[PDB]
Amino acid sequence: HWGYGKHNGPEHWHKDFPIAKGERQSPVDIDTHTAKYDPSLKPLSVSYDQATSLRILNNGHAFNVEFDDSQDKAVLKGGPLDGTYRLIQFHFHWGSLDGQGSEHTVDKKKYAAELHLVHWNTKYGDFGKAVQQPDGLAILGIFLKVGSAKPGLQKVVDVLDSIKTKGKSADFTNFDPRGLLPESLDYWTYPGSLTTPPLLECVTWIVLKEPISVSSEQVLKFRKLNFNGEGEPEELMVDNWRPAQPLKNRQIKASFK
Ligand SMILES: [Zn+2]
């Protein structure tokens, strides 16, 4: 019964998920001055040409755009990564107001939202096994700020009325996630965790520096979703972000000077 409410939110999660207080929890604040350029890092390789979106699901905490991950069709490689990681889903975290919503922060700055493209390491054969490994997942994080519209986001926004409440899904084929990427692939990277229960410490985080712009109207539509199920009291799905966690014995590396 974890969530983001007044009485089941992030500060409570440790009771059911004690790793919430672990050594490699996410998100974190990215202190840009102390992140060090690492010339050994390689460009990332984001290969989404063959991606097969299938469905969009309101799971009660966010909405997931789900992919076919039964072959290497949409893969993330390079950067800090050893080997090949399959896109399984993307989702967002966002605020009730434009001044908040991101999970990672940059010199304590909160963005309006944050996109997570979740990929699992093909060495481990599927997702459930991958989350049990320290290098099981690679999550590409992309900040959203409010300004111009993101044209490539609009098809997502327009389907949200059909998945207003927890447990609703809709067909969502032929969506191209390349339309959610910023211009630059410059990034920060560090070892961390899932940001939702079970908070497993299985993620190589790759957080892009360049945000994407979305319009006020687009984020407003995110904020019309519901945490609740159909026929239940309405609870707007807003502020579904975990705050920054202690960095502990980690270094954040930059791909760029
Ligand atoms: Zn996330």
Residue numbers in the entry: 4 to 125, 127 to 261
Paper text:
In this study, we investigate one of the most challenging cases and describe the subtle effects brought on by a Val143 to Ile (V143I) mutation. Structural analysis was performed by comparing the catalytic intermediate states of native and V143I CA II, which were obtained by cryocooling protein crystals under four different CO2 pressures [ranging from 0 (no CO2 pressurization) to 15 atm]. On the other hand, the active site of V143I CA II shows noteworthy modifications. Finally, the two intermediate waters WI and WI′ show different behaviour in V143I CA II. The intermediate water WI is visible even in 0 atm V143I CA II but is not present in 0 atm native CA II [Figs. 2(a) and 2(e)]. Among the five WEC waters in V143I CA II, WEC2 is located close to the mutated residue Ile143. Initially, at 0 atm CO2 pressure, the WEC2 water shows multiple alternative positions (W′′EC2, W′′′EC2 and W′′′′EC2) [Fig. 4(e)]. Compared with native CA II, W′′EC2, W′′′EC2 and W′′′′EC2 are new alternative positions that are observed only at 0 atm CO2 pressure in V143I CA II. Therefore, the fact that the structures and dynamical motions of the WEC2 waters are significantly perturbed in V143I CA II is likely to account for the stabilization of W1 but the destabilization of the two intermediate waters.
In this study, we describe the effect of a single amino-acid variation on a prototypical enzyme, human carbonic anhydrase II (CA II), by correlating its high-resolution reaction-intermediate structures with the measured kinetic parameters.
